[PDB]
Symmetry: C5
Subunit: 307 residues, 5 copies
């Protein structure tokens, strides 16, 4: 079984697509293995770039296809190169930009943790033909973090394995296991942008909603919460157009719902305060002073939803 040692050089992980559960990786693949010795010009190793690799492949050089298992679509490949050594060994070297796929839970956006994954597995040779001897991953990364959207935690965690397929070809003995390289990079979303620009004003809006109770008349109280209502809606629209599209609510969505809830609840209180009476216009001296009651009741429920 030919031992292929692999190297991934990750140049950029960027472009996350939340709806698609997809992220873009720019980098190099390096694959190395040893064949039967060759005679090269001089006796210094031989270089074969791009186009000529196919010419070499035609006259019979084994360059096994290594497919990116979790790539969506087939990757943009840049220069390719062969280094042929006389002692037999072969080095395949190529640049790639691919859009990769992984399960991505975004429900605690903008406080989500994600993991970028690469899965590599030979397209046609099983573990008895081609086996992954090792893999190094160079994440040429560090520092300058707050300008950066995602905070990389690790330094590329790795797992080589054997994948067994129960449903394949006309194959019986044990030729149904392929070797797989799985590369993981752990990350955390930098939530500041959402804290200052989405969370904060959404809060100031919700906060001032409560100031409806500092209004003198009932006509004033009831008529204003309609504006307040229009404002939360105005805010949702501002929000939605900019934030990632998901098939679920985020923490920010729920704050909006809660704002809708708060204002619609005050509507009930404002209306109820008025018509529950011992005459007709008995505004409950005590209930009308829930100006401090349910800002902190919202503050209590604010903590209860987080548990």
């Amino acid at each position: 079984p030919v031992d292929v040692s692999v190297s991934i050089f990750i140049n950029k992980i960027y472009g996350v697509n939340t709806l698609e559960q997809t992220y873009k990786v720019d980098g190099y693949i390096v694959a190395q293995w040893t064949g039967k010795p060759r005679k090269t010009p001089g006796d210094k190793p031989l270089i074969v770039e791009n186009t000529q690799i196919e010419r070499w492949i035609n006259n019979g050089l084994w360059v096994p296809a290594l497919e990116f298992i979790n790539v969506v679509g087939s990757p943009d490949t840049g220069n390719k190169r062969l280094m042929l050594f006389p002692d037999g060994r072969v080095i395949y070297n190529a640049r790639f930009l691919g859009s990769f796929s992984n399960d991505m839970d975004f429900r605690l956006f903008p406080f989500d943790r994600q993991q970028f994954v690469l899965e590599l597995e030979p397209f046609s040779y099983n573990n008895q033909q081609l086996r992954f001897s090792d893999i190094q991953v160079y994440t040429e990364n560090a520092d300058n973090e707050e300008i950066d959207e995602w905070w990389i935690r690790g330094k590329a965690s790795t797992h080589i394995s054997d994948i067994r397929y129960d449903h394949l070809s006309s194959v019986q003995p044990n030729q149904n296991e392929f070797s797989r390289i799985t590369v993981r990079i752990d990350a955390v979303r930098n939530p500041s942008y959402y804290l200052w620009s989405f969370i904060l004003p959404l809060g100031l809006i919700i906060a001032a909603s409560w100031s409806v109770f500092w209004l003198e008349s009932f006509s004033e109280r009831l008529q204003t919460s309609f504006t307040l209502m229009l404002t939360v809606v105005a805010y949702a629209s501002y929000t939605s157009n900019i934030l990632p599209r998901l098939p679920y609510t985020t923490v920010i969505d729920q704050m909006i719902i809660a704002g809708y809830g708060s204002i619609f609840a005050a509507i009930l209180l404002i209306i109820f305060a008025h018509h529950r009476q011992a005459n007709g216009v008995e505004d409950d001296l005590l209930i009308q002073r829930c100006r401090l009651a349910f800002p902190l009741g919202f503050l209590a429920i604010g903590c209860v939803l987080v548990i």
Copy 2:
């Protein structure tokens, strides 16, 4: 008449385009048939990957083209492999990402059931030349529905059938029946996002809109439903920028129509109250107390849409 057995491996179904009635599928086709026996190197099956498959084809390897009927555009193809066994049999193996077309009725959005379909048919060989002998489809599926946009339901439907074409070339005898593979994968929409961030708050606005009748004055009543009206427009737009583009109204779209509708009737009821009089400002104590009438009048007419 050659028996061709096929396997589809579905990796990801994603990117539904509502306006286009379209969705993306990543996966593998495996097609197999038996030829006249070959003398292969050693005696184990010969592997041929990508660039070299053409070379075998140029020298007369029969590799029949199996086209994806309902593909829009020509699919992105990944690695291809030919495996030539010595006893005659040949297996074609390839990866694809393609956009497939199928009738997609989105009218009960966000509660639609959709069906992702793949249709397979030889491009040049009819059922007397090439026949589909059987087909399994593996949906490497499980888990995390709650994380996903669509929830797949069945295990996948399969049907081999024979399609007869009545109008073609100058060929008649019986070369007009092609053998067809049809794959069906059932799905349901994840409704929850739309329930909580569209339906519910649109629902609160509708109700709180009705609180306009709890206003004491006539002037307050009428002037206020104009803000209520402006709110629904603002809401409608929020919805519009976010929801899928269609050529018909969805259940949400209708909720907005009703919202506009409730508000406009309220204008009428409120004006009717005022100027229908025995003085000038005799607001029908009873009709202004339709504070209970058309809130539950809306629920009756809302439940009439269920037939």
Copy 3:
């Protein structure tokens, strides 16, 4: 002059681009013509799919280029096939997805009728070298209009003709008339979404706008109309995001202008009623009670605009 019979199978018409005056057609071209007898294996017709076709051309098979005249950019091609008959004939068979160009008037959107057109014409052989003997077009059609954006109406129209070019090569006598196929498909827009979701509420807004004259006070009357004005802009904004970019107004675009007018009209009337006085509030004791005047005076300007 080689007689070529053509067949187009129209699979999908989708992707209208109103700014570009463009649409997408998925389908197959079939071209048939007769050369000199060939020897085919057995004596049964010979099949040549995709890759092998070019190779036949290298050995001199005449496969003439038939160009899509009105295609924007060059079409995505699927599988190509040649059926070479021993009796002399050749049949060319191809799938295409193309972005096609045609004049499209959108002024009565969402009630426009459009016609999707294909224009076929040889790239290198004139009508005395190659002539279109005929052309039939199959629109595999039926059902589900209510599901679709466009309603195909006809069954497809035809035109075989001669296009005369006055300025060409160093050759003058008659290498200037090429034969052209024109395929025409009629369509109507499914107007229902824009009917219920844009027209109706836009109407209810305009309608309820007129209820300004039912307000007792002048402040009520003049200030309320400012809200109305804001509502129409909000409505304008709501719309624009969804409507197609055109360089002219549509029907909806006019209802909007009509609205701004009706509102701007009342601002003036409300100011006029009040400040044309012999005191300060000498409202033309009746004019303010034009609650029927320019609502139905507006309706009059509406039917005349349909001239």
Copy 4:
């Protein structure tokens, strides 16, 4: 010095990209010149389409690359044809779709004049090797401007010229002047949509804004002007959502500023009228009667911008 005559057929100029200063051109290029005499089948001119052209090149057919200087990216090419006449002459014919670049000032949008440009210059041969002998451009354009985004005006400006490059090899004699073909086609924007749906309603907003002064009270005067303000903003968003992206202001932009300009001046005045006093409520009965004063001042400042 090979005389090459060039002919361009322009089919569609479309898809202007304002941020990029880019527009699309679909059409055919035709280049003609005479080489040394050839023996053709019979003695009738020989046609060489697509694939077969390369074959002719590999055997030494001189086919010079003529590059589109101002093309962004490389053009989409459709069919190509070589016509080889026996007397020596060669005719190259190919269809193209390209994104072309030219300086585009959009500041008087929507009343801008633009010029679509093509620049053709050999990639490898200087004016002493390959010279452009003449060039005609056919603009198969006409009719129906009212339907189209752009109004093509002229019949196309043409200039064959000599371009001198100062920095190349160790060459002294004269190898540094390349011959260039330049096509100019003038156009004007169809302003109608923006006139009717951007300028007119905008003016009415501005106009109806000045009616803030016909309000009786001060509250009304100040409080309403905030409503007016929100309106200008709402209008601004609707506009931006739709208007082309630029790095400078357009006429419309300036209008929006003016709307903001009108309102903020009005607020100042309304407060000034109120508190500039000899009492407390000496509202300047006259300055609050600047109801026609700064409508003609906005009109004066509007017409002065042309000076």
Copy 5:
């Protein structure tokens, strides 16, 4: 150790993607080196364009791969040309369009400085095989700045340097230093559009927001701030849709934040004015008349944040 001279001709820098930290460059690479003498037709240099360059490479011509280290995806290449001189020297010539990557801090948008960078480094040859001898960059730009999005300011920076890779393949002796060309171009953003259309009206919004204190009553003061609140929100959304998506805040973002705060600050000030009393309605003469106070209190907090 082969000396390579390089030239970059920058035709266009355009299409910055703020989220991707990406920009587009159109231009030509010219690489020159000296090989072993050739016999060319006559003795004048031989020109070899496009398709034919591979053919020369197939026969063993060394045309080394020079990679753009920082390009995202593989560049679109136009014409390629090989110039083979008889004295030995070889000149490679090509047009390119690529999307390049580089670090871009966008935080003081729209007054940011950015730098468009090109990085070139041989794909397979280290500094002992292939060395960069010198490099020029020509930016055929000038004039018309006030029309363009970025104002290129300096000329262009160049640095030939040696990159040492400590961890590669299994090669150690000295094969780990590659020579790298680095091109730097400084640019500043055209701030004008944002100053006039975004900053300016926002100032007018914020300022006129403070005139809420010139209102006589408490109701006028409190309720009107809710209108002010809705206005700033509307301004935010209008802005959002238009400004470049970043994962962190800009100057304008903060202005919006500030604007929100200003409004929320005043709600508190206004309510406090009402309820901090020695009667019930002691509206604090200074705090009610803080009409000069936090208009200039906002200017104090505004300038220190600039420091």
